[PDB]
Amino acid sequence: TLVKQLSSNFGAISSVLNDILARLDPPEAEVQIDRLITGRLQSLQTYVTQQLIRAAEIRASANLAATKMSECVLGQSKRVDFCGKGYHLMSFPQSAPHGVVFLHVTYVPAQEKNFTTAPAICHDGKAHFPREGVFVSNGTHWFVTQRNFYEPQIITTHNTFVSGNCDVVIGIVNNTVYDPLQPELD
Amino acid sequence: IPINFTISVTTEILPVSMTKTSVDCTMYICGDSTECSNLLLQYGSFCTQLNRALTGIAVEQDKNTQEVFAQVKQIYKTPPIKDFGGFNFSQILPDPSKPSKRSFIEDLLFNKVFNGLTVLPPLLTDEMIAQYTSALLAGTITSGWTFGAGAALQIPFAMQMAYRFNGIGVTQNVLYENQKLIANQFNSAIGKIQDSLSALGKLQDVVNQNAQALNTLVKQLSSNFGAISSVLNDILARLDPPEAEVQIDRLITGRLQSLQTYVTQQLIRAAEIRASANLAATKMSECVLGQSKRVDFCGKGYHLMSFPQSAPHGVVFLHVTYVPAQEKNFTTAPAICHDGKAHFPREGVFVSNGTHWFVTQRNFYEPQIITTHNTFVSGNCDVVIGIVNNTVYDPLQPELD
Amino acid sequence: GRDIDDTTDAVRDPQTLEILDITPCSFGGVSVITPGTNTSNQVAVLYQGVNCTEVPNVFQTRAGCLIGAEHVNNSYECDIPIGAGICASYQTQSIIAYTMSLGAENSVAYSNNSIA
Ligand SMILES: *[C@@H]1O[C@H](CO)[C@@H](O[C@@H]2O[C@H](CO)[C@@H](O)[C@H](O)[C@H]2NC(C)=O)[C@H](O)[C@H]1NC(C)=O
Ligand SMILES: *[C@@H]1O[C@H](CO)[C@@H](O[C@@H]2O[C@H](CO)[C@@H](O)[C@H](O)[C@H]2NC(C)=O)[C@H](O)[C@H]1NC(C)=O
Ligand SMILES: *[C@@H]1O[C@H](CO)[C@@H](O[C@@H]2O[C@H](CO)[C@@H](O)[C@H](O)[C@H]2NC(C)=O)[C@H](O)[C@H]1NC(C)=O
Ligand SMILES: *[C@@H]1O[C@H](CO)[C@@H](O[C@@H]2O[C@H](CO)[C@@H](O)[C@H](O)[C@H]2NC(C)=O)[C@H](O)[C@H]1NC(C)=O
Ligand SMILES: *[C@@H]1O[C@H](CO)[C@@H](O[C@@H]2O[C@H](CO)[C@@H](O)[C@H](O)[C@H]2NC(C)=O)[C@H](O)[C@H]1NC(C)=O
Ligand SMILES: *[C@@H]1O[C@H](CO)[C@@H](O)[C@H](O)[C@H]1NC(C)=O
Ligand SMILES: *[C@@H]1O[C@H](CO)[C@@H](O)[C@H](O)[C@H]1NC(C)=O
Ligand SMILES: *[C@@H]1O[C@H](CO)[C@@H](O)[C@H](O)[C@H]1NC(C)=O
Ligand SMILES: *[C@@H]1O[C@H](CO)[C@@H](O)[C@H](O)[C@H]1NC(C)=O
Ligand SMILES: *[C@@H]1O[C@H](CO)[C@@H](O)[C@H](O)[C@H]1NC(C)=O
Ligand SMILES: *[C@@H]1O[C@H](CO)[C@@H](O)[C@H](O)[C@H]1NC(C)=O
Ligand SMILES: *[C@@H]1O[C@H](CO)[C@@H](O)[C@H](O)[C@H]1NC(C)=O
Ligand SMILES: *[C@@H]1O[C@H](CO)[C@@H](O)[C@H](O)[C@H]1NC(C)=O
Ligand SMILES: *[C@@H]1O[C@H](CO)[C@@H](O)[C@H](O)[C@H]1NC(C)=O
């Protein structure tokens, strides 16, 4: 568009200065040259302003890309949906013409299983809470497992910590803790 | 060490989009005269350039709205049974009574706000945005943060609250032994929010600015710009082309300058709104779909969760936070050495009430007794600057009998 | 009679002494909807923001009636946008105009003692 703005009269008799310098002497060629100058100055100013705005936008995008490169690649990120959908593992940077490309490696759970849970378990009047897992049951027994991958273990005194009595917790069930100390006393 | 705690709901307002307008270029500059159009035709592609810029801005507005709100693919719905462990989300959930599926707050928000100048309807109406917000609320309530990474995983709300406390260094039992208290506090806070709203300067400033700019553009049509009249119909008459051409040229130059100024201001404002929309999208993605640990990013205090609500050309967040209330001055000690072995706290801090010694978590006074499972040994109490003498229970010798 | 815009909107007839109101003729804009010249040649034209009594298949929309395309009762993902929650596509062959669908709908099986 900047190139094509050079073929407009802008109110003159011709769009080429070589046809104004000829066929005319300065005294009345000056006004037409002034008209051309004003038109081309306006075009230049418009182009420069648009370029400045676009450069600001590209600067913002480049800052975002630099932050992504610094955080997703050089370390593991914990900001949700910042380095891809799902839990973040790592990223690999690749170059591109006037740009950068990231290959985010993520982790997504696949298959679910409906379970019946319980906030806590009280053995002998002492409510046991899970240390780091969640209480699940398959229907007949009770297990403790991590949240993000079914790995059922057996309730012991090292997967739970005691606090109070099972009289104020809203949801509570009755079960027994293994307590692996009495079998070895013999 | 704090002894009590309070739950506080905080609101935040962010502009997202602005009105999409398109300016009929040749209708503004010349109206309907053929001579004026022929005389303007010899300047260049200014007209087309302005139209292209003003269409790009309009496209970008819908891109902004779609980026902010369209973050979920499946429209979740809450079950008719409302058993959330005592919490009451009736204020923010949609009600069938209202024709539109807007909540009690999403509607209170909506009640607080020839030339060639045309406006364009938004791509998404105010019903689809409300459906998106309802879906986000249902997903957050019924599945926690799991719906932001894959398929929704149902979980009781109380257990989700317990795990969200666990995420900020407060053990689970604090919730389970106080569930009614937090429920009542949250209900009172969410009531106070609607009481206070019944405020939106950020959402109103953009509307006022756009109206003022459009009005100034309209009013620039009554200036002579050095001619004999401000109406082209009085130039076409009373004059023949040979000397009407100069005055028409003056009018054309003035109106082109006005159009360029308006377009430049609109472009700058659109860039600012784009930045604000990107910030709002980041807040929606991080504070809502998961628990945040960036200090003072989703409200003051420790973050628990947020609930999104829509607003005219904007989005509103209700950050739920956790703030300690009452303090108690205590005397502490870096470590305790029992028999020449310095014991350090596993995850707590050593405190004393004057006569005995206890170990407690930092964010809620819960004094326990020092044992061999709350501490780990290292070296001897000869190099630690601050050390005291005490005994560890070591619950093994009483059971040996 | 004058308005905020400083343009005349009322005039008194110099003969019958009766006042008359003047309003502009609808102009709007013209947009063309195409699925690409590689696939087909049929196009649909959208006369923006005009009650199409004025314009010389018609489907009235809030953004202006769309001609050359049929209206369906179904709802699919938005292919190309029109405005006010309406999108058009080349699925069925002719050009169809429908209401955009947010996505698949599912209800989470939620209860106070169930986890997944
Ligand atoms: C729940 O899981 C437990 C543990 O695997 C199951 O108990 C076992 O069931 C198998 C199948 O008959 C037996 O061979 C084992 O001897 C059982 N072990 C114990 C310790 O009881 C139980 O059957 C499962 N319940 C359901 C409904 O699937
Ligand atoms: C867990 O076990 C305890 C003790 O066996 C139960 O407590 C008793 O429950 C019976 C049920 O009717 C009551 O009549 C008693 O008054 C309770 N207390 C005592 C001291 O016996 C408790 O109910 C069980 N939890 C259940 C079944 O969920
Ligand atoms: C922590 O603060 C809450 C809020 O004041 C206290 O709850 C109050 O308890 C008293 C005594 O039962 C009641 O009369 C008030 O009505 C309660 N207030 C509310 C808002 O429910 C709570 O007691 C405090 N915790 C401690 C350990 O003192
Ligand atoms: C510091 O806390 C300990 C533990 O609660 C207090 O010791 C108890 O004090 C009460 C009050 O007379 C007695 O009934 C208990 O028998 C004490 N228990 C033990 C294990 O000694 C102690 O009094 C507190 N000190 C201060 C200054 O408040
Ligand atoms: C903790 O107890 C030890 C042993 O009882 C103290 O170590 C002795 O402290 C006395 C105090 O005058 C010194 O005279 C001894 O030389 C120290 N060593 C031995 C082997 O007895 C220690 O000072 C106590 N820590 C205190 C009081 O802060
Ligand atoms: C678990 O069983 C319930 C009971 O019918 C059902 O509603 C739910 O969809 C099931 N969940 C899965 C993951 O199978
Ligand atoms: C769970 O909900 C059922 C309703 O089906 C109710 O009978 C039961 O008491 C509830 N239990 C808890 C712990 O909320
Ligand atoms: C929730 O709040 C509403 C509004 O005040 C009230 O009518 C209702 O009883 C409260 N509780 C439940 C369970 O809806
Ligand atoms: C604890 O006691 C000290 C000693 O006077 C006092 O300066 C301080 O303010 C007290 N702190 C609290 C929280 O009461
Ligand atoms: C703490 O400061 C007091 C000054 O009041 C000093 O006597 C004491 O030795 C200091 N102790 C430590 C462990 O810094
Ligand atoms: C003009 O003449 C017509 C009939 O000849 C008459 O009705 C009208 O009142 C007269 N005056 C004006 C101002 O039209
Ligand atoms: C046009 O459509 C055909 C058939 O779908 C496809 O094979 C081709 O790649 C497309 N593009 C061009 C340039 O032909
Ligand atoms: C268009 O004009 C007709 C004239 O009777 C009217 O009935 C109809 O409601 C109008 N439609 C719109 C969208 O303005
Ligand atoms: C679409 O729905 C309307 C009203 O529900 C009905 O009159 C019309 O026949 C339907 N068209 C088709 C193709 O189902």
Side-chain angles (χ1 to χ4, degrees), chain B residues 152-230:
Chain B
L153 302 176
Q154 70 263 15
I155 188 174
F157 193 77
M159 284 188 70
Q160 170 180 170
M161 201 46 58
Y163 292 161
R164 291 193 180 263
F165 291 170
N166 195 1
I168 63 176
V170 181
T171 61
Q172 300 188 7
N173 56 3
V174 175
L175 174 82
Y176 277 124
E177 310 206 310
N178 292 292
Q179 194 168 356
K180 286 141 72 53
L181 171 61
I182 297 89
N184 283 358
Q185 294 200 1
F186 174 70
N187 296 336
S188 173
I190 186 167
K192 196 171 309 178
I193 292 295
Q194 70 89 28
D195 179 22
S196 173
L197 286 175
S198 198
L200 304 182
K202 293 181 179 179
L203 298 188
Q204 198 79 40
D205 282 347
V206 293
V207 176
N208 295 336
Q209 280 172 24
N210 294 329
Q212 194 185 213
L214 183 63
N215 184 64
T216 303
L217 190 68
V218 168
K219 195 149 272 293
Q220 291 295 109
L221 270 171
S222 310
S223 297
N224 319 131
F225 291 104
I228 65 172
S229 303
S230 54

Side-chain angles (χ1 to χ4, degrees), chain B residues 32-155:
Chain B
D32 53 356
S33 167
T34 296
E35 291 182 351
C36 191
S37 287
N38 290 318
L39 183 62
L40 173 60
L41 183 63
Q42 65 191 17
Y43 283 173
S45 179
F46 283 135
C47 197
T48 314
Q49 199 170 7
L50 300 171
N51 289 318
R52 185 152 31 211
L54 284 177
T55 52
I57 288 185
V59 172
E60 181 145 290
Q61 302 314 309
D62 295 329
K63 181 182 306 319
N64 286 338
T65 312
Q66 188 274 331
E67 191 146 330
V68 188
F69 275 111
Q71 305 210 309
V72 295
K73 292 198 173 186
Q74 308 194 26
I75 302 296
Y76 308 92
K77 283 305 302 169
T78 182
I81 303 285
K82 293 179 179 179
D83 185 354
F84 298 129
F87 294 81
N88 198 357
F89 302 96
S90 299
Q91 296 311 282
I92 57 177
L93 272 194
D95 45 12
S97 54
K98 278 171 143 33
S100 57
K101 311 312 268 175
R102 295 207 303 265
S103 74
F104 196 56
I105 305 181
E106 280 206 319
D107 186 31
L108 197 147
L109 264 292
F110 283 172
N111 292 115
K112 287 313 188 43
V113 190
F114 171 97
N115 292 319
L117 294 174
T118 66
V119 294
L120 302 174
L123 182 46
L124 295 179
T125 57
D126 288 78
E127 301 178 355
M128 281 155 248
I129 286 158
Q131 273 182 71
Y132 283 163
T133 58
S134 72
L136 274 159
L137 291 173
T140 298
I141 289 167
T142 63
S143 52
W145 60 88
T146 62
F147 86 102
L153 302 176
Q154 70 263 15
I155 188 174

